[PDB]
Design a protein around this ligand. Structure first.
Ligand SMILES: Nc1ncnc2c1ncn2[C@@H]1O[C@H](CSCC[C@H](N)C(=O)O)[C@@H](O)[C@H]1O
Lengths: 362, 100, 536
């Protein structure tokens, strides 16, 4: 409803850019931050008044020359320090502590490569890693252990990139390249225990390692929803927000309207449709966007640099309040966007190693 | 080693494979699920092994069947394998007497 | 007058239902958002609880003064900054492997026209007869526009409505379980039919994973299983007139007490097992004493090898003629096949007595192992739990899986080793996977060729085995034209397997190798590497 661009940047490595996320692990008044990950580079930025931006810490990786495109905010509940968990095309997870200015932690074992990193909304120590292996890998970062594994056999028939966390972290989602919609509860009795003993381990306690768990049955599945490449799925309470490469963002909830999300069965596949948000020229993958912390407004970038904005108030896609923000200079692509913890600051990524920062006119 | 007679996920695979039958009652379903799950748990293939399987199904988890009280389906299950020429008359009474 | 007009608006009523789609969307659009507002602040409330450290900028490092620095400019007028790039710690270059599940077995493998109506046949004569210038005209009236089913099409659609009212919630032919308090008097053929359909003899269980194939379970043994006739085998049982002894064959002091219908449900099941046991029938279920159980029963009575896939080849009455499938498949007429021991294609078995895997043994000489009932002479059925038997053609039957060690192979990614030393021709676990048909093998083969993967093997002339999505450890073993081990196809009671055995004497620490035996395009594109040094 109110978002104009007053700032932009561009770096020198020229690689197509990757995900950016704003430091929602902050305080109302602390310096709010947003980072940026390159193919082998990682960096951060600071937002200042009058549109000013100062480049923060920057790191490179020359030994492992593979793309790094997955990141997740990290925070230490004990020492009250935020961090950032990053991974790329080799499946090794690196954790950066700006205060420590060093990356010292071992996380290897991933199959091919990681295509998503996210943390639990409450627990700042548990990281979600998604694989092109059609399986879901989990790591307890503080304990450096391997949390239960999802989608070993009964996962998506094609590559999986996208997932989501509810604010309780009650369940976890899987939406593969095959347009299927697979969901796993985290509130499982077996799951919750394995979380507890994940913190309960000692190398000298036993010769046995932390016995992980294989879980494969997804609580829901549907395929007729998307006829084209799906690359973005979200949660709106009991609703399943989703975006494909078909120039149509769509949201739905499984089965009938009265059906509660927490009582669904794996065998069920009924879906009743209630949403539609079409767009244009964004019919390609590698396209991710941002959602505000309060989950109220969205910023849909486009490969020509166009920004599609729609509100999620009582104003619904039935009326689809439109706002097609656009800047002329950028036309390469928009891999990712980043709403701030507040709604004031917006950051848009332009593919030619360039950034465009928009500010809300609150 | 991870060398066991049956991986854990396969147990629920057949559980899903059995339970999908909309035309089969739960009492017969639960017993055969219990009956499936022990067979690969011990890997018995010969006729005497199947005879030894039944005497091991009872007195080890047939009390659970007694706890589940799913006897009448099991008795028809017991005569089924009897009529399937895998079990003799003497074996079927052992399960009958174990409950009583 | 208004009769027709009220009729005229009757078939136009469907368009009113069009806008009912958005009746409850806004209502739920408020409920979900309201709950979202509750949840978002709670996390923010918790976010309010934990203090969070601010950020710190870099600085010149005495030991890293000349660290390479990148420069970021502004697409806008903002200044350009240059900051060094501190490289992260070394990371172990680990070979790539694809997700799977541990498998220890082998398992067989928007239109513009719509429809709809209203079942108001009571009032269609009000529509027509009381609405002309009758009831059956609804099919025709609904049929002029292609937006609904035709007059006949609606008739089958109405047949669904009667098939929608229906009796109580139950499948049309299934019956409640006897354990249930609502146990019915389902007779032996109907009750066992569910067991009949679900059971599978090949793996002697119900609904074999590894196996529409079905046979009538009528068995060619003697027709009856009679036990006792006119004799007091029970503590108190009838004898009566002994002329009924032949009468029981011909069919093929009275007293009594009450009965129950539910107990009678298994009473004539019991007469299906013995047909004359006056006592075991009383022993299992009966409201009468073993004397009177006769009284209830009498009134109740008065009331050149291999190539193809194995098959239980059939010829019920006729002997093993040309109609016997094994004649075509060119293999044995095994016990599951409908040939008897008379049928010359009967398999004798594992005829050895001392060792039943030796050079001169039909188990070892042929492609078939010794079933526990085949080399009984050498203890093929001796304590299957125990691993010590003179019959070594039972390792897969007893599941004596080897300890395979996953390891990373310089030849190709990962690899498989063995924990214990193994001499020449000792067992290694089977290539556990899934058995697919030839056509899907063509489909999956091009899929696997599209992804450049190797977990597919032709089972036989009739089938192909796949172990890609689910497989065992050995599928991760590499290949060598000079392998230390080998793969040999095994038969088990008419089931295709493949034994893995070591070519030479081997100690712990040697990588496993074999040959895929693939197509020419498959071989060079995958295993065109053999790790040899060229000097010149
Ligand atoms: N002997 C060999 N040398 C080089 N590559 C091989 C190979 N055998 C299989 N491969 C490749 O490896 C892939 C399957 S993985 C099998 C290789 C090895 N055992 C491992 O576990 O990693 C196939 O796509 C094939 O191209």
């Amino acid at each position: 409803y109110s978002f104009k661009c007053v700032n932009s940047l561009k770096e020198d490595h020229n690689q197509p850019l990757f995900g950016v996320q704003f430091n929602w692990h902050s305080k109302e008044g602390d310096p709010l931050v947003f980072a940026t990950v390159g193919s082998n580079r990682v960096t951060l930025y600071e937002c200042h008044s009058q549109g000013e931006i100062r480049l923060l810490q920057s790191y490179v990786d020359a030994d492992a020359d593979e793309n790094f495109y997955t990141c997740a905010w990290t925070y230490d509940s004990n020492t009250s320090h935020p961090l950032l968990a990053v991974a790329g095309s080799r499946g090794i997870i690196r954790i950066i502590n700006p205060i420590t200015m060093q990356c010292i932690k071992h996380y290897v074992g991933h199959g091919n490569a990681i295509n998503e990193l996210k943390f639990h909304p409450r627990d700042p120590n548990l990281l979600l890693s998604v694989s092109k292996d059609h399986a879901l890998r989990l790591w307890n970062i503080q304990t450096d252990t391997l949390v239960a594994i999802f989608g070993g056999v009964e996962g998506h028939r094609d590559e999986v990139l996208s997932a989501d966390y509810d604010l309780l972290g009650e369940k976890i989602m899987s939406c593969g390249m095959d347009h299927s919609l697979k969901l796993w509860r985290i509130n499982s009795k077996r799951m919750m225990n394995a979380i507890k003993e994940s913190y309960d381990y000692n190398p000298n306690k036993t010769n046995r390692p932390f016995i992980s768990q294989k879980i494969h049955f997804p609580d829901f599945s549907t395929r007729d929803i998307h006829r084209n490449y799906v690359d973005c799925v979200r949660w709106l309470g009991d609703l399943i927000l989703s975006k494909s490469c078909e120039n149509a963002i769509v949201c739905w909830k499984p089965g009938k309207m009265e059906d509660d999300i927490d009582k669904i069965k794996p065998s069920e596949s009924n879906v009743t449709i209630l949403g539609r948000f079409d767009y244009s020229q964004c019919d390609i993958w590698y396209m991710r966007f941002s959602m505000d912390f309060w989950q109220k407004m969205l910023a849909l970038g486009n490969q020509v640099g166009k920004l599609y904005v729609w509100d999620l108030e009582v104003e619904d896609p039935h009326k689809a309040k439109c706002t097609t923000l656009t800047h002329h200079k950028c036309g390469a692509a928009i891999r990712q966007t980043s709403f701030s913890r507040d709604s004031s600051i917006l950051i848009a990524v332009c593919d030619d190693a360039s950034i465009w920062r928009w500010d809300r006119l609150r | 080693s991870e060398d066991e007679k049956d991986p854990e996920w396969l147990r629920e695979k057949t559980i899903t494979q059995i339970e999908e039958f909309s035309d089969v009652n739960e009492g017969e379903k639960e017993v055969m699920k219990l009956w499936n799950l022990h067979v690969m748990k011990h890997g018995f293939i010969a006729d005497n092994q199947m005879n030894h399987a039944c005497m091991l199904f009872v007195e080890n988890y047939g009390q659970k069947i007694i706890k589940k009280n799913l006897c009448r389906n099991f008795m028809l299950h017991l005569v089924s394998m009897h009529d399937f020429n895998l079990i003799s008359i003497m074996s079927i009474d052992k399960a009958v007497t174990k409950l009583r | 007058a208004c009769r027709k007009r009220v009729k005229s608006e009757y078939m136009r009523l469907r368009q009113l239902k069009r806008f009912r789609r958005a009746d409850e969307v806004k209502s739920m659009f408020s409920s979900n958002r309201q709950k979202i507002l509750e949840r978002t602040e709670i996390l923010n409330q918790e976010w309010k609880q934990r203090r969070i450290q601010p950020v710190h900028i870099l600085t010149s490092v005495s030991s890293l003064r000349g660290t390479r620095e990148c420069s970021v400019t502004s697409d806008l007028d903002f200044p350009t900054q240059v900051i060094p790039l501190k490289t992260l710690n070394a990371v172990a270059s680990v070979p790539i492997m694809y997700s799977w599940s541990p498998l220890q077995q082998n398992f067989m493998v928007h239109g513009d026209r719509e429809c709809g109506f209203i079942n108001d046949e009571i009032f269609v004569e009000l529509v027509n007869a009381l609405g002309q210038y009758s009831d059956k005209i609804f099919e025709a009236i609904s049929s002029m526009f292609p937006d609904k089913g035709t007059a006949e099409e609606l008739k089958e659609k109405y047949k669904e409505l009667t098939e929608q009212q229906l009796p109580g919630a139950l499948p049309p032919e299934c019956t409640p379980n006897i354990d249930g308090p609502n146990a019915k008097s389902v007779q032996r053929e109907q009750s066992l039919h569910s067991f009949h359909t679900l059971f599978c003899r090949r793996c002697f269980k119900y609904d074999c994973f590894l196996h529409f194939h079905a046979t009538p379970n009528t068995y060619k043994r003697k027709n009856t299983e009679t036990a006792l006739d006119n004799k007091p085998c029970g503590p108190q049982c009838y004898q009566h007139l002994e002329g009924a002894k032949e009468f029981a064959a011909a069919l093929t002091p009275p007293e009594n007490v009450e009965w129950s219908g539910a107990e009678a449900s298994m009473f004539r099941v019991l007469i299906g097992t013995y047909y004359d046991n006056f006592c075991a029938i009383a022993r299992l279920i009966g409201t009468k004493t073993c004397r009177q159980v006769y009284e209830f029963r009498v009134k109740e009575s008065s009331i050149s090898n291999h190539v193809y896939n194995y098959q239980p080849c059939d010829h019920p009455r006729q002997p093993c003629d040309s109609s016997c499938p094994c004649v075509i498949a060119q293999n044995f007429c095994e016990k599951f096949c409908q040939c008897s021991s008379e049928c010359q294609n009967r398999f004798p078995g594992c005829r050895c007595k001392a060792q039943c895997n030796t050079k001169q043994c039909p188990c070892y000489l042929a492609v078939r192992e010794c079933d526990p009932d085949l080399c009984l002479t050498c203890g093929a059925a001796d304590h299957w739990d125990s691993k010590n038997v003179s019959c070594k053609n039972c390792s897969i039957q007893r599941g004596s899986k080897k300890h395979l060690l996953l390891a990373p192979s310089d030849v190709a990614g990962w690899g498989i080793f063995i924990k214990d030393p193994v001499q020449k021709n000792e067992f290694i676990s089977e290539y556990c996977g899934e058995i697919i048909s030839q056509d899907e093998a063509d489909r999956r083969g091009k899929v696997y060729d599209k992804y450049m993967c190797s977990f597919l093997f032709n089972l036989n002339n009739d089938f192909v085995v796949d172990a890609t999505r689910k497989g065992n450890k050995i599928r991760f073993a590499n290949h060598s034209v000079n392998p230390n081990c080998y793969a040999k196809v095994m038969m088990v009671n008419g089931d295709h397997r493949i034994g893995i055995f070591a070519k030479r004497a081997i100690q712990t620490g040697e990588e496993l190798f074999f040959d895929y035996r693939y197509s020419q395009a498959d071989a060079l594109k995958y295993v065109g590497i053999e790790r040899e040094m060229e000097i010149p």
